[PDB]
């Protein structure tokens, strides 16, 4: 997939003044565009960015005219984002003293897209305009503009100082015109395409999520020996690790090729050096001694397999397996290979039967040849959009461990007295992060942890920024929004003072 980005900011006069209690739309949307360029910089996505800082005191645009396409400075055309562009935006921008139309800039960016998005392969186009709606605009080309946006496949969004839920009549009629235009583009849902500037901060503050496409792995779901079904494996969860990762470079020269991580193999006697990649044969420890195994004998005596071999070993009760024992690296999602409906309905029969009879399947698994086989739970899942089945590694016997762990109900030496018990009751009721809402028993899960970005990547991108935007400078601390993000929502902490206080007088806390 591909996308084209053309941001449009105004550098007029009105945004140079605002209420002293709130930052001006100039600097507000300025921080917004800065950190948006940050987003599409860190993400390695092939999105190409262009900038139009219209409302200029001059006019530097390919469509310059006396009154047609006037007061526009195209910052740079539709190419890849890069740091120096961000720095120049942070610096080169200047407060203005003029006022200019935005439909002008909209058509200018339209022409840029029509002039470049066909010269290079593209799939979807986006136009974004930031302004304060203090312009003098005529509704002449709006029909034609929206027509081209439909034909050129460009989505228009507007971002405005006011909130939908104190502006000039100029701004008010501009807002009505904006509503008309957006509805004239998509429909009634055009209301959602109206955006303020504070909510832009709220919805944008986090760094870009690391989206990760999976692989269409189709497999033959085998049950018995005569009921093969084409099955498509997709994914639900994987411990995500960074994709760009640390290149080792020499100081004061900063070239990668100037370093060799060559490995040399020696002998313990007189430091004799062994020839690197043919005199060593891999051994193994069998008690005291070492057995000269090798690589060729490895490939000859290694265990073999037929291949995909996703074959059902059998069916079992839900409680027959447990949460604890789930031994997977990753959790698959088991869906039908598309375009074969009969397979899908057969799988649906499977899933629903397992669901109502709370039965669970156990299937031999293997991603492919030369890979270790795998046995684990095949759990079925139901969603109103679609039924689901998921596979997880469950342990082999050597992988399971056993421990005594002397029990606790022998607490004649610990003695949880009733005062402590009802104290802990007061706690676990009072710090209850989740509490029922809307009478639908959707508890107060304002800590889903499923929508929350991984702070590791947040800190990594923040570091790369802070030491990219600057030359050598010391690192900053954790941005407070990250900490507020990681910490529980405040009200839970507020409710917690009294119960923890009653804890501190009821237990020993030796050093």
């Amino acid at each position: 997939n591909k996308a084209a980005v053309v941001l449009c900011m105004d550098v007029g006069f009105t945004m140079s003044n605002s209420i002293p209690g709130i930052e001006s739309p100039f600097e507000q949307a300025k921080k917004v565009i800065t950190m948006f360029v940050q987003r599409q910089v860190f993400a390695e996505n092939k999105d190409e960015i262009a900038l139009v800082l219209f409302g200029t005191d001059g006019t530097d645009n390919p469509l310059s005219g006396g009154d047609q396409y006037q007061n526009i400075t195209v910052h740079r055309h539709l190419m890849l984002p890069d740091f120096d562009l961000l720095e120049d935006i942070e610096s080169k921008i200047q407060p203005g003293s003029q006022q200019a139309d935005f439909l002008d800039a909209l058509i200018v960016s339209m022409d840029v897209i029509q002039h470049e998005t066909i010269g290079k392969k593209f799939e979807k186009r986006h136009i974004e305009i930031f302004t304060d709606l203090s312009s003098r605009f005529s509704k002449s080309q709006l029909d034609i503009i929206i027509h081209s946006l439909k034909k050129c496949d460009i989505s228009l969004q507007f971002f405005l100082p006011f909130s939908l839920g104190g502006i000039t009549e100029q701004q008010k009629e501009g807002l009505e015109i904006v509503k008309m235009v957006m509805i004239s583009l998509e429909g009634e849902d055009g209301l959602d395409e109206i955006y303020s500037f504070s909510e832009s901060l709220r919805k944008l503050c986090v760094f870009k999520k690391i989206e990760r496409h999976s692989i269409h792995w189709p497999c033959r779901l085998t049950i018995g020996s005569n009921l093969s079904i084409r099955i498509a494996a997709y994914k639900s969860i994987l411990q995500e690790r960074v994709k760009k990762t640390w290149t080792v470079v020499d100081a004061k020269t900063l070239k990668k090729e100037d370093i060799q991580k060559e490995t040399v193999y020696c002998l313990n006697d007189d430091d004799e050096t062994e020839v690197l990649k043919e005199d060593i044969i891999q051994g193994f420890r069998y008690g005291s001694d070492i057995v000269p195994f090798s690589k060729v004998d490895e490939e000859q005596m290694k265990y073999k397999s037929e291949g995909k071999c996703f074959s059902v070993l059998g069916f079992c009760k839900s409680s027959q397996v447990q949460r604890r024992f789930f031994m997977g690296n990753q959790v698959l999602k088991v869906f039908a290979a598309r375009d074969d409906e009969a397979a899908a309905v057969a799988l649906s029969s499977l899933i629903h039967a397992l669901d109502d009879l709370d039965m669970v399947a156990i299937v031999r698994y293997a991603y492919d040849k030369r890979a270790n086989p795998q046995v684990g739970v095949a759990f079925p899942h139901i969603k109103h959009n679609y039924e689901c089945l998921v596979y997880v590694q469950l342990p082999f016997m050597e992988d399971l461990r056993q421990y005594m762990f002397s029990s606790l109900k022998n607490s004649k030496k610990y003695a949880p007295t009733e005062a402590q018990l009802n104290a802990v009751d007061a706690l676990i009721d009072s710090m209850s992060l989740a509490k029922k809402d809307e009478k639908t028993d959707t508890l107060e899960d304002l800590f889903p942890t499923t929508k929350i970005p991984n702070p590791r990547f947040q800190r990594l991108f923040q570091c790369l920024l802070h030491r990219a935007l600057h030359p050598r400078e010391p690192l900053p601390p954790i941005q407070q929004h990250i900490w507020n993000m990681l910490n529980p929502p405040a009200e839970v902490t507020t409710k917690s003072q009294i119960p923890l206080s009653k804890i501190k007088t009821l237990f020993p806390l030796i050093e």
Binding site: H126, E128, S155, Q157, Y195, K203, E211
Partner: peptide
Amino acid sequence: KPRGLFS
């Protein structure tokens, strides 16, 4: 779900 500008 949020898309485009938000995604």
